[PDB]
């Protein structure tokens, strides 16, 4: 009972922290007019996705940690729900990274690429892809298509209902690997651009405000994307690596339950850590946060 109790406590604490941080970000963007733009719109969409993860995905994952005898398809649907919510969070983060890449490396077309309803279109595409990938097991690609309980009912654990081939070849590659590679490429491009600008400017004392602004924006974006990529990888890679070596290592010792709990809580900590750290990197966000806190008190 001790392990289950501590796991549930950690999961609920993560959910509450994600809820608080993301509602704070949304409140700050709603209040300040100087915070209302496309990048903050993507940040708010990611924050809402993380709110959904904390309210729904985390309690649902706790529900699949029980193992009580229940219908196979209901628990398959719950697992697909948590999958869809995590997909939405990851795709919103990728959208923010793409917005930063367009802003930094494509300044002239930026107003013509992401402004207007195109941001809503991109968010809708992210959610559609999330639902499509997360609801593929419901099309018959599942184990129930095996006698923990019997006659349709099973012990509701994630691996009992969700096949591993989908989790490795499909979920790990398209959802956790491809966005990670894209974010790494964007970070590398912005880092190289920033260091090229710095090397160009270092020869001259007293540079123009134009060059100073360019270097400032490039460095800030590069460090923000470094933080984003590092946190995303640290949170998501362990669990999917565990899945990969469960699928590829036959009869090898299945990961001890504490390791599985740690991987799950890290994957959920992704949703609370992003994009609050990114928001705190901007002076306006933290100024608004402090003003709201002072007004409340």
């Amino acid at each position, epitope marked *: 009972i001790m392990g289950s109790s501590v796991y549930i406590t950690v999961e609920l604490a993560i959910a509450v922290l994600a809820i608080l941080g993301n509602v704070l970000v949304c409140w700050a963007v709603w209040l300040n007019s100087n915070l209302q733009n496309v990048t903050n719109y993507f940040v708010v969409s990611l924050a809402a996705a993380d709110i959904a993860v904390g309210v729904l995905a985390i309690p649902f994952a706790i529900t699949i940690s029980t193992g009580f005898c229940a219908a196979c398809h209901g628990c398959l649907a719950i697992a697909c729900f948590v999958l869809v919510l995590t997909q939405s969070s990851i795709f919103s983060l990728l959208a923010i990274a793409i917005d930063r890449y367009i802003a930094i490396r494509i300044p002239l077309r930026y107003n013509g690429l992401v402004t207007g309803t195109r941001a809503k279109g991109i968010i809708a595409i992210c959610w559609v892809l999330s639902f499509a990938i997360g609801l593929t097991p419901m099309l018959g690609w599942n184990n129930c298509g095996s006698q923990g309980c019997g006659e349709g009912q099973v012990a509701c654990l994630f691996e009992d209902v969700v096949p591993m081939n989908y989790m490795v070849y499909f979920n790990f590659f398209l959802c956790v690997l491809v966005p990670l590679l894209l974010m790494l490429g964007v970070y590398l491009a912005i880092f190289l651009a920033a260091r090229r600008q710095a090397k*160009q400017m270092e*020869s*001259q*004392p*007293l*540079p*123009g*405000e*134009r*060059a*100073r602004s*360019t270097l400032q924006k490039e460095v800030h974006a590069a460090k923000s994307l470094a933080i984003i990529v590092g946190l995303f990888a640290l949170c998501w890679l362990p669990l999917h690596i565990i899945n990969c070596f469960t699928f590829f290592c036959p009869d090898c010792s299945h990961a001890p339950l504490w390791l599985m709990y740690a991987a799950i809580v890290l994957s959920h900590t992704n949703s609370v850590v992003n994009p609050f750290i990114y928001a705190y990197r901007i002076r306006e966000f933290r100024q608004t946060f402090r003003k709201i806190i002072r007004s409340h008190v």
Partner: antibody
Amino acid sequence: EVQLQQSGPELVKPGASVKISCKTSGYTFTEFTMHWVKQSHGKSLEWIGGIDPHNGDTSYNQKFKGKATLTVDKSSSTAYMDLRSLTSEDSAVYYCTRDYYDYHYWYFDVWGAGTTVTVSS
Amino acid sequence: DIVMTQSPAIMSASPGEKVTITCSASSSVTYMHWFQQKPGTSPKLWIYSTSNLASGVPARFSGSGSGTSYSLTISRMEAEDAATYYCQQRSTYPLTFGAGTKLELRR
């Protein structure tokens, strides 16, 4: 149309000081640094220094440090140089230029008309 | 610092004649600028970044050079081109100009 309007001629006696003006127009004044060039006796172009109108940063030629002080009026979009403790050596023609940034390098884009400062008792 | 020495100091050229004037740097320089000044008037940017003609500069003017030696050339001399030309450096501060080359029209 980027233009730099300088002051008028100044005849002063040794020991006095003058403040040359440079009125900018046609471009965002704070975006590019302003530099001052002295031409003495003809065919002798000397770089005095530059000032960033955005934050007031300055870089002077060590030859003219203490002789020339660069100030800026962001509201009025003008740049000033003060030539203190004038002697006959300082009698020359002084220009103000705009240091444009091409995203690849820097160069003096627009030059002022120039001001003739003659110092003698 | 760095020293810019231009050659020839004084030169005359008939109209239509190809004219090349050089600018020697004491140490290596990355870029060289060129300014044309006529008597009684302020200097005007002519060539920037060692090859690029400024606005309003005729295509007959060309810029070249790297490291120690730099030069500009005129494909065919015109009467409008009789002036003084200065080369500027901004690699190692302070900025240094050249002594200039007075270009005269042969008659």
